[PDB]
Ligand SMILES: NC(=O)c1ccc[n+]([C@@H]2O[C@H](COP(=O)([O-])OP(=O)(O)OC[C@H]3O[C@@H](n4cnc5c(N)ncnc54)[C@H](O)[C@@H]3O)[C@@H](O)[C@H]2O)c1
Ligand SMILES: NC(=O)c1ccc[n+]([C@@H]2O[C@H](COP(=O)([O-])OP(=O)(O)OC[C@H]3O[C@@H](n4cnc5c(N)ncnc54)[C@H](O)[C@@H]3O)[C@@H](O)[C@H]2O)c1
Ligand SMILES: O=C(O)[C@H]1O[C@H](OP(=O)(O)OP(=O)(O)OC[C@H]2O[C@@H](n3ccc(=O)[nH]c3=O)[C@H](O)[C@@H]2O)[C@H](O)[C@@H](O)[C@H]1O
């Protein structure tokens with residue numbers, strides 16, 4: 001089987017490409033233009049491993065500025081992860097790259113796939129389509145995004161449904177809930193908090209730090225994601241939440257980091273940032289049934305793997 | 316009060332400006348960049364009448380290339396109608412202008428409205444956000460667009476909710492269902508079919524013609540739209556369907572046009588086009604409660620009004636043609 005992974009150099013993409021190459025039957029093409037919030041220097045580390053593997057080909061081009069026909073000619077399966085993420089930096093003049101890379105990219109990819117016989121188009125979306133909800137959110141709730149980021153990502157999901165309904169592109173949508181671990185993007189909370197604690201800088205807390213997330217360890221994220229390809233149930237057309245083992249507030253995470261490091265951290269409490277919910281909490285009922293998905297990695301184990309990664313990254 | 320109408324020279328926006336200016340208390344600012352499917356020639360006639368009213372100011376500029384600060388200073392209410400419409404022409408390389416003019420325009424207008432104090436931001440959306448649904452659809456149904464056009468308009472609606480929840484911009488969303496009547500855009504079904512019927516050319520029918528729509532006569536559309544400004548109900552944050560008196564198939568519309576025109580039309584049945592639902596049908600309970608909205612124009616009367624308009628347009632002897 002031959003698999004296209006968009007955003008292959010990023011946090012999740014780089015890990016997905018590695019998981020797929022462990023199956024000797026899979027050949028992987030990754031495409032990534034090295035844009036978004038992660039500096040390109042921190043991303044070439046994500047893929048040095050991948051380039052050595054002979055069943056892996058890499059293309060360093062903009063999806064909007066590449067021959068999509070030739071790229072897709074022999075592809076069985078597309079994993080679409082390329083996007084501009086980041087809830088907090090999608091306002092004012094920063095919005096355009098979200099529309100270009102989350103809406104125009106998705107539309108251009110689906111236009112290239114509409115006359116191709118794919119087995120699956122696996123589109124990666126986000127808990128940020130949901131906005132503020134009481135309790136564990138399942139995939140049938142009316143999504144009302146709180147951020148412009150969330151809007152552009154919901155717009156990509158909608159494009160998948162348009163091309164599925166009209167051209168029978170075999171879409172599956174996965175909604176990730178805050179992914180963490182080694183190679184986590186430097187604009188995310190745990191990367192920032194661990195780097196600040198290691199440099200003896202004040203920890204930046206937005207709001208009161210009592211906000212919670214369904215933190216999903218990267219290896220759990222990748223198991224659900226690979227499962228979306230390998231499951232024997234028809235999941236064509238389904239939206240599936242992929243969430244984590246254990247929910248935690250930022251205050252809780254800072255305590256667990258102080259226990260790993262033995263350090264006492266200075267908290268810097270800043271203004272809340274608009275467009276973030278107080279709580280995310282995935283119902284993973286559907287991923288249970290359809291993918292046999294069960295997250296196994298504890299926050300203490302995950303947090304420590306990310307801590308080690310951050311120490312190695314900056315030494 | 317002072318009202319800004321984006322897309323003021325378009326089909327609906329030109330009728331809304333005309334309806335608002337009948338109120339001596341309303342001053343209207345219209346902005347329109349003369350783009351989208353209607354050629355700039357036919358569009359100038361839409362507003363002919365309006366430049367005479369000294370309470371009307373017309374601005375011919377791109378919302379993305381205009382001082383929105385100067386534009387919004389004195390505005391009490393924004394009617395946001397500017398967009399690229401057309402379900403059928405929203406694929407492939409035609410998609411980018413829908414994204415620029417439906418998503419980036421809405422975001423940039425909401426950004427400019429952050430630090431003024433509107434009474435209302437009345438955002439015009441479409442039944443195309445719902446996709447294929449059975450029965451009369453209410454505003455709480457999960458919208459799953461069938462067309463790239465539908466996606467861009469649903470994205471505008473979500474941007475309204477983001478700017479509402481975060482910055483208390485007092486958004487109201489109206490979902491129109493297929494609007495027809497005098498000044499209807501030349502890319503729409505009735506304009507095309509009437510023009511083909513008038514010229515004794517084959518009538519272009521997509522699919523078998525049994526597809527139905529909630530056709531909204533423009534005066535009905537516009538009464539619902541002014542009601543969104545004038546209701547004493549609190550409708551801030553609400554999505555409201557605006558639908559028509561009578562649902563009909565394309566085959567039924569053609570029969571009614573044959574009766575108005577006295578002509579026997581040749582049918583050219585074409586392959587159905589992607590992105591179109593078989594049916595649209597608004598549940599207008601909400602608009603009835605919240606706006607006192609009740610559509611009163613029959614298809615027979617509305618179709619005759621559009622028939623006469625299309626005939627007059629293509630004689631090219633009226634000043635406005
Ligand atoms: N990290 C999370 O917690 C999280 C949670 C929910 C959803 N997601 C989604 O998962 C996906 C990956 O997130 P991530 O954290 O790995 O992000 P990332 O920025 O590390 O990786 C995405 C990659 O996409 C690439 N890309 C963007 N636009 C491109 C374009 N036009 N052409 C080619 N390459 C392009 C970037 O260069 C980047 O390397 C995204 O779709 C994101 O929205 C992430
Ligand atoms: N006509 C219908 O049946 C119908 C039904 C549902 C909803 N709608 C919505 O009603 C609104 C009006 O549609 P219409 O049929 O009157 O269309 P129209 O094309 O006649 O009017 C829209 C106007 O917006 C202007 N415009 C577009 N982008 C602009 C920009 N960037 N800056 C300035 N002006 C810009 C165009 O020049 C055009 O005159 C749209 O928002 C459309 O989606 C229409
Ligand atoms: O864009 C993405 O890919 C992701 O964006 C969302 O992830 P988030 O929850 O934003 O992740 P994360 O950056 O770990 O912030 C976590 C918390 O820490 C707070 N936070 C953050 C940084 C900081 O320095 N301090 C702080 O308190 C911050 O206020 C927040 O409350 C989606 O939920 C996710 O599904 C995905 O789309």
Ligand SMILES: O=C(O)[C@H]1O[C@H](OP(=O)(O)OP(=O)(O)OC[C@H]2O[C@@H](n3ccc(=O)[nH]c3=O)[C@H](O)[C@@H]2O)[C@H](O)[C@@H](O)[C@H]1O
Pocket residue numbers: 400401402441442443491492493494502503504505507508519520521522524526527528565591595
């Ligand atoms: O943005 C817009 O302005 C509108 O786009 C949508 O209007 P539509 O329904 O497409 O209108 P309309 O062009 O009158 O086609 C009606 C029917 O005639 C058929 N049709 C059309 C043309 C033709 O020559 N022959 C034909 O059979 C065609 O197959 C279709 O079934 C939204 O529903 C509306 O809410 C609004 O957003």
